Amino acid sequence: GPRPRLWEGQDVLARWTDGLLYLGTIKKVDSAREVCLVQFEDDSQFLVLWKDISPAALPGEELLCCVCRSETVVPGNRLVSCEKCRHAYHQDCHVPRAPAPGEGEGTSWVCRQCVFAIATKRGGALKKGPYARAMLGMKLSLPYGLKGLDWDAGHLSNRQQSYCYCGGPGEWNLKMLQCRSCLQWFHEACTQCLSKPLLYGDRFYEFECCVCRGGPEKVRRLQLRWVDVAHLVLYHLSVCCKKKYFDFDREILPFTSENWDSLLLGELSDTPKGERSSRLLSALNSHKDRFISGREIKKRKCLFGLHARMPPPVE
Ligand SMILES: [Zn+2]
Ligand SMILES: [Zn+2]
Ligand SMILES: [Zn+2]
Ligand SMILES: [Zn+2]
């Protein structure tokens, strides 16, 4: 065709596996694999699926639905403009169907991409205000067909890499929650029900999504045991820091101490520090099936790391 949607040198927003949008520049378009090599603001380069790439509108493209690229307007399906990004959508090209002017619910209408761009946040999306309310509205619908997804055997990943309310990519074990009803996975940043950010690898939750609920999410934090605490802290640090071994006194205990309330430890919350340390140390030292230990006595280091790559079992 004479006018591709994407091209080398184009500035774009790309949705990452955390559901968030990052600014980048397209370096390569691969039409065989339907991906682009995108260079981000830290100069990192990654392949991104075309579905997860949004370019800006060119001058002269208010005539055009940004989804289907078409001019045409027919009765019942008009073009509507986003009052944020000023891109245009056919009512039926937007999910959910975009309201005709003056027929919306709030002060005004802003598109799904913009609502998510403004409302999603690391640690959990905005909970209060117009964008938070608009996001909840958007989240009652999915922008992809759930039933068509090609899942792996354990229902952890699908070939389309369509997850969550956003339809972005994602890694089930990295700050995502699985809905108990539809078994789809949802990003931390796209949810509105958490009181604290998720530990990587933490599945000690029960979750039900907005689509299944037909309204606000429901979530509950399950009770951890000390072995679960040790395993989850080590997993989280392993992911955050991309290394295997962590020093107890310099890294593990301070992390647990400094982030204590965020770990949502339930009944373990008032463990009095000295006992905090010894209980955690005991868990790390005693479960050799989970934890490998090491020593560097000349540096006064006591090291622990995980045996297994998989996140802690939920029991
Ligand atoms: Zn998401
Ligand atoms: Zn359209
Ligand atoms: Zn918009
Ligand atoms: Zn669900």
Side-chain angles (χ1 to χ4, degrees), residues 150-161:
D150 300 327
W151 291 96
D152 58 17
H155 210 105
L156 304 174
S157 70
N158 61 71
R159 180 182 59 81
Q160 288 82 353
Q161 301 191 41

Side-chain angles (χ1 to χ4, degrees), residues 65-70 77 79 89-93:
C65 176
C66 68
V67 169
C68 79
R69 315 193 83 186
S70 175
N77 193 25
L79 286 173
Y89 295 82
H90 281 120
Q91 295 178 276
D92 294 323
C93 284

Side-chain angles (χ1 to χ4, degrees), residues 64-210:
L64 321 190
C65 176
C66 68
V67 169
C68 79
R69 315 193 83 186
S70 175
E71 279 58 15
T72 176
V73 170
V74 302
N77 193 25
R78 64 162 288 166
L79 286 173
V80 175
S81 286
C82 177
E83 295 175 54
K84 169 49 179 192
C85 67
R86 285 306 170 179
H87 286 54
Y89 295 82
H90 281 120
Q91 295 178 276
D92 294 323
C93 284
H94 192 275
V95 41
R97 171 175 163 93
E103 305 179 15
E105 300 202 1
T107 284
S108 168
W109 187 78
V110 169
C111 82
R112 188 182 189 93
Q113 186 73 268
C114 287
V115 169
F116 275 70
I118 300 308
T120 59
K121 299 289 172 181
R122 297 183 175 91
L126 303 174
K127 303 179 184 297
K128 305 278 202 58
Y131 272 90
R133 293 192 300 271
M135 196 196 183
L136 180 57
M138 303 278 181
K139 284 162 58 165
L140 304 175
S141 306
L142 297 176
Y144 58 88
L146 243 189
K147 293 185 325 260
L149 299 180
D150 300 327
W151 291 96
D152 58 17
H155 210 105
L156 304 174
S157 70
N158 61 71
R159 180 182 59 81
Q160 288 82 353
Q161 301 191 41
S162 291
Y163 306 91
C164 190
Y165 310 106
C166 56
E171 300 187 52
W172 62 277
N173 57 309
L174 300 182
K175 284 176 175 289
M176 301 193 78
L177 294 166
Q178 189 177 40
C179 175
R180 65 173 299 190
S181 292
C182 63
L183 298 187
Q184 176 60 288
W185 295 83
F186 297 80
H187 301 112
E188 172 196 87
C190 298
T191 64
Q192 287 164 293
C193 56
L194 306 175
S195 62
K196 304 287 176 174
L198 302 174
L199 288 162
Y200 290 118
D202 193 345
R203 301 202 57 192
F204 285 79
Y205 290 92
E206 192 166 14
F207 175 73
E208 194 169 359
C209 80
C210 292

Side-chain angles (χ1 to χ4, degrees), residues 17-35:
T17 50
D18 56 14
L20 297 170
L21 297 174
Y22 295 79
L23 182 62
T25 300
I26 294 184
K27 307 304 292 183
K28 292 293 195 172
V29 184
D30 183 333
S31 60
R33 283 195 290 180
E34 295 184 354
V35 291

